[PDB]
């Protein structure tokens, strides 16, 4: 309808675990870590519906902030890897930074935005 919407998914890992539970209950053969084959397709289908529409479509937009919880800071895990491969960028929060006194604990080296610059005010860009 031309409006702008912000959507927050506070945990995609729990949704993935629930989908794994459903798939195992439906007798569908498991894959890595008992996850089903289309665990990547699930999140890709979910996250590809957020977009900036063109002027012919109304000009509305939908921005999403999915959440992923790691285990002991391990990033090479299946679900974190899959979600990182989909989104436009990631923000990294680290416990050692959190306890060192810097809050928010954003890791500047690991965090990145693929739309940076174009999504900033001119003064901030300068």
């Amino acid at each position: 309808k031309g409006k702008h919407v912000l959507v927050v998914y506070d945990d995609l890992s729990k949704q993935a675990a629930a989908y794994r539970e459903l798939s195992l209950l439906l007798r569908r053969p498991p894959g890595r870590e008992a996850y089903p084959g289309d665990i990547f397709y699930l999140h890709s289908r979910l996250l590809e519906r957020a977009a900036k529409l063109s002027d012919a479509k109304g000009g509305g937009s939908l921005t999403a902030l999915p959440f992923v919880e790691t285990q002991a800071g391990d990033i090479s895990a299946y679900i974190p890897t899959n979600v990182i491969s989909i989104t436009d960028g990631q923000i990294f929060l680290q416990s050692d930074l959190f306890f060192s006194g810097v809050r928010p604990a954003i890791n500047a080296g690991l965090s990145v935005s693929r739309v940076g610059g174009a999504a900033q005010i001119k003064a901030m860009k300068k």
């Binding site: 498991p30 894959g31 890595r32 008992a34």
Partner: protein, 55 residues
């Protein structure tokens, strides 16, 4: 002369202690690496067999 002799002896002792500590750390890390390798093989074979017999 006494200061130089003391400095050389102190360097020798400190390097010996550091070498011993490094060797012990190597041993512990090797033990942990072997346990992790065994666990990884177990997990991969268990997933293989579960997927194979899930048909």
């Amino acid at each position: 002369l006494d200061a130089k002799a003391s400095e050389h002896a102190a360097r020798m002792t400190a390097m010996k202690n550091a070498t011993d500590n490094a060797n012990e750390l190597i041993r512990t890390l090797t033990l942990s690496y072997n346990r992790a390798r065994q666990a990884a093989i177990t997990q991969e074979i268990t997933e293989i067999v579960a997927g194979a017999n899930a048909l």
